[PDB]
């Protein structure tokens with residue numbers, strides 16, 4: 001099988017806006033994770049063809065990755081910050097679903113998730 005098309009990063013039917021919380025998610029939260037040592041598996045959609053994972057998209061039907069999130073933020077795709085936080089949590093949960101506890105990539109996702117929640121907590125009022 002082919003790869004699925006990636007998640008949409010624009011949608012002409014979906015109202016858009018920019019907010020201070022969404023700007024923080026791009027300029028601080030995404031930027032911090034993108035530069036982390038463990039970012040690389042998460043910087044683009046899972047290419048199940050290149051990785052020889054014919055079952056990846058049989059198991060994971062809601063894919064998400066930080067390349068998509070970065071484009072959504074840059075495109076002002078979202079209406080609110082909780083939509084973007086949900087995309088990060090989908091990405092982490094997909095990794096935990098497909099893989100097993102203690103696997104290398106699961107420990108990498110757990111480190112990124114810990115840092116993610118720290119950066120969210122730091123959002124100034």
Ligand SMILES: CC[C@@H](C)N1c2ccccc2C(=O)N(C)c2cnc(Nc3ccc(C(=O)N4CCC(N5CCN(C)CC5)CC4)cc3OC)nc21
Nearest residue numbers: 040041042043044045046047051053094095098099104105
């Ligand atoms: C361990 C689970 C890891 C495979 N993994 C998974 C494998 C099986 C099943 C599930 C997963 C999984 O859940 N996720 C999130 C993955 C997503 N994307 C990828 N993509 C990549 C894989 C290899 C390379 C790849 O061949 N390379 C060359 C050397 C580079 N290194 C970067 C860091 N520096 C220090 C050394 C060179 C980068 C790594 C590059 C990749 O995407 C860019 N892999 C995932």
